[PDB]
Structure 1
Amino acid sequence: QIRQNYSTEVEAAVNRLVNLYLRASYTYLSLGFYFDRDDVALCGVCHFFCELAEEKREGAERLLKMQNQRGGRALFQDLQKPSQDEWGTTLDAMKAAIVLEKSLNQALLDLHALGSAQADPHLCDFLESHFLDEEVKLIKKMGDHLTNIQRLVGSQAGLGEYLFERLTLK
């Protein structure tokens, strides 16, 4: 037995966070293919979201690996379908993505608070090394996108949406 200073509460919260990252991965998968539709056709937006799907899956896998390293047991639940089947405009999609990220970030913060209360400094190191800063960086990038998309909706919404995709998402 390797397990040491690893609470059942942390263990459960880690499994839940795995589920959240995989669901976020699935949502980005859905976002990406929506933007590849022939009637939506924003290549840059598709690529931005499909790269996010991959990053979220890798996040989940790092959690799992850590679960195993600590002597916890991975438990998998259903992955709930994404919150929408169609994602509207690039603006709507980027808003949906930032809401999703802030929810992941809150989960990460709830898990740090749990780790601190349980006195689990390995867990806190883990999250600091691989999660907190990356999530902050992503959220800042999404905020930057949203600001640029918004400046580009004048009365020429189609034009702005094309330009953003061609000149930022490049």
Structure 2
Amino acid sequence: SQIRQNYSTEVEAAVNRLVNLYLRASYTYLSLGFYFDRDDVALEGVCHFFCELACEKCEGACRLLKMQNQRGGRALFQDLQKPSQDEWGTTLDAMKAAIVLEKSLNQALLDLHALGSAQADPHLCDFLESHFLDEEVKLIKKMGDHLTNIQRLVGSQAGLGEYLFERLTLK
């Protein structure tokens, strides 16, 4: 590489693995989105929430791939595993699966940051802090707020609660 400088093979490979994780997350959210569009599920605000997250995760993948080429690394794509479920249950089940997925992405970001720290790669550490770590903390906080509101609404009238959350929060 004519440009590569202070860019370890370890970080280059970890960045490719992180792109895979972000594209798998995007695929998971595409499945969640279309599940909530089923005529027998029919929660449009939940459809929109997850389709928006499919787009945001594809953006994170593309940002990583841009940075890989800016550093002189080589993008390598792997197969994208299908999402973990075909049917996603209630909005509560879906939001629980989403926060588990985002905690796994956050841990992957923190692991890559630690690798960049170990490799003395301050551009990598800046890139993640600037475009990923705060976005991920913000999203996980929003999902926790949603989980608490969804849980508050179950009580003994779960259908009513699920409708109201979709109508009055995800509108």
TM-score, normalised to structure 1, is 1.00
CA deviation vs aligned residue, 1:135-158 (integer Å, no higher than 9, x gap):
000000000000000000011000
Q: Partners in 1 of 2:11 and 2:52 — Cα distance?
A: 29
Deviation at 1:90, TM superposition (A): 0.1
SS at match of 1:82: coil
- How far apart are 1:97 and its partner, in Å? 0.1
| Separation in 1, partners of 2:54, 2:26 | 4
Aligned to 2:81: 80
Structure 1: state its 5+ residue gaps.
none
State the distance in 2 between where 1:164 and 1:122 align. 41
Q: In 1, Cα distance between the equivalents of 2:60 and 2:25?
A: 10
CA separation in 2, counterparts of 1:140 and 1:152? 19
Map of 2:115 onto structure 1: 114
Specify the alignment match of 1:43 in structure 2.
Answer: 44
Task: Specify the alignment match of 1:13 in structure 2.
Answer: 14
User: CA shift at 1:89, angstroms?
Assistant: 0.2
Distance 2:113 2:91 in 1: 33
The separation in 2 between residues aligned to 1:129 and 1:20, in whole angstroms, is: 19
Rounded Cα–Cα distance in structure 2 between residues aligned with 1:44 and 1:158: 15
| C-alpha distance after superposition, 1:7-60 (max 9, x if no partner) | 000000000000000000000000000000000000000000000000000000
Structure 2 runs not aligned, ≥5 long: none
The Cα of 1:160 is off from its aligned counterpart by: 0.0
Compute the displacement of 1:3 (Å).
0.2
Equivalent-residue separation in structure 1 for 2:78 and 2:113 (angstroms): 22
2-structure distance, mates of 1:110, 1:128: 13
Tell me how far 1:78 sits from its aligned partner.
0.4
Deviation at 1:103, TM superposition (A): 0.1
Counterpart residue number, 2:94: 93
**Aligned-partner Cα distance in 2 for 1:117–1:42:** 46
Deviation digits for residues 83-102 of structure 1, max 9, x if unmatched? 00000000000000000000
Superposed CA offset, 1:59-84 (max 9, x none) = 00000000000000000000000000
Deviations 1:92-131 (A, max 9, x none): 0000000000000000000000000000000000001100
Tell me by how many angstroms 1:165 deviates: 0.1
Stretches of 4+ moved more than 3 A in 1? none
Normalised TM-score (structure 2): 0.99
1:164, CA displacement in angstroms? 0.1
How many residue pairs get aligned? The number is 170
